[PDB]
Design a protein around this ligand. Sequence first.
Ligand SMILES: O=C(O)CCCCCCCCCCCCCCCO
Ligand SMILES: O=C(O)CCCCCCCCCCCCCCCO
Lengths: 269, 269
Amino acid sequence: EVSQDLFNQFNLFAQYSAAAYCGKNNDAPAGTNITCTGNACPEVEKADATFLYSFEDSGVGDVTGFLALDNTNKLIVLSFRGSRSIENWIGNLNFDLKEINDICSGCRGHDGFTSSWRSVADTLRQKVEDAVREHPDYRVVFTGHSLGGALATVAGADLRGNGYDIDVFSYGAPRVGNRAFAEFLTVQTGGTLYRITHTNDIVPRLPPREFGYSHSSPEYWIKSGTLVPVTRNDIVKIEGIDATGGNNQPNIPDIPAHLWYFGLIGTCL
Amino acid sequence: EVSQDLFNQFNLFAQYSAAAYCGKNNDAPAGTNITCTGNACPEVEKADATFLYSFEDSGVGDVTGFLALDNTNKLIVLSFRGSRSIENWIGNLNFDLKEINDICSGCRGHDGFTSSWRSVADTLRQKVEDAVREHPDYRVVFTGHSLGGALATVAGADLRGNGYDIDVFSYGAPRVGNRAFAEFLTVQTGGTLYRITHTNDIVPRLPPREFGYSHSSPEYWIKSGTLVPVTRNDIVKIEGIDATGGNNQPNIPDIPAHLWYFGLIGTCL
Ligand SMILES: O=C(O)CCCCCCCCCCCCCCCO
Ligand SMILES: O=C(O)CCCCCCCCCCCCCCCO
């Protein structure tokens, strides 16, 4: 249902996303090999990849993640890490929008994600800029799981059209803002967004449509169960703003589903 | 390296042992279906399987677990929970031995595992007897992960030779006593102990040999990595008390490895 290649790409960014949680970063000097505990990120481990800059609890958002250089794959990787405790993060998730004309006109994004990104937008733009300067040939990728996937998405929309493509690969991300904004993300050039989801994962169903939120298209939806390995025939491309039939179906959502994207993610053995 | 039938049984009781941590409520009334959060136990869900008795913080050692009827697979299963926090359990772990001539001539066993079991033995022996009566054709199986594996193993050594075979399936169990006990467990009749280990899991390496502890023979050792699905080709039987070159190797040991036996175990998504 997707190609081998694009699968491998989904697999690799799910691990950079998992490494945001299970990596040895911070108290990590720049230039360090990236490794994870608990077999969280073996594809990232097999590559020649190293931190370019680590951040922890940065800004009003208390944002955490890392910029990586991968010379094996010729990436620059911005990987945001979701919440340290997802269930609490879901419980306290506030649904307020706020205006974001900076990125698109008439676009409203989750005030909270957009606020948190804003607060670190300058620093991280610079670092990504440095890294694009040093390696002009490298693909720039932003990625993340859960609240991480949200950040990568907001950051990515914010920083496109500035000379380099930015590809975004998000895993179980929540909705990030209103319909205008969903439309922006569906068509905005200068990068592709790959919005990945799994079975009845709860996180992509928040905030709810009823509070003003809409989902960009397309959606890449993993059919295979929680703790079950994913094959190419287990991922289905679902076209259409707010399409139903992928993750957005009328059943009871699930938190374990959220923690299984190709492998264990958002928690560390 | 092991038969398919045998690989099916390991997988199954690895799920019953995981159910001891993830199966929904220990206030579950007698006779209710067995289910788990997070896809921890789908081979158990798929069977007609029900609780016979549920215990929690029972006796002086706070033992937790259940007895179960599996009308599909024709089993009575006593499954013991390991520790709710393994990492502390490891570090708080005392190495004192105690005489156990009650079960075994010249046998010394771990003091807490041994007292814990003694202290709930009479109750649970009852409960199992009642079941053998009712389903005389059913295989009795005791099982357990981590501390729970050690409990199943002590219970198994202690309640054999009373008419009905006890098979025992232990997953990441530490050492349970001295050389003598090790030999008893290797040759005792009235059932088979199946002592499963995974890669470089630390729990089967504790207490140390240098503390007077020995492991029964054989061992079944899963060589596939953490988070890797297991096939019957990934398990190796190692013969000989204290054999090395299965889990008992001099390399650096690991905790994530202890939480992956056929699938997630010892922790609940
Ligand atoms: O609506 C909002 O603004 C967000 C509400 C949810 C708050 C719940 C707290 C969750 C606790 C976990 C803290 C880890 C966050 C790390 C962020 C890394 O980018
Ligand atoms: O040497 C000993 O006596 C054992 C030492 C380890 C003590 C750590 C306490 C365990 C805390 C978590 C509670 C789970 C125990 C439940 C046992 C179920 O069979």
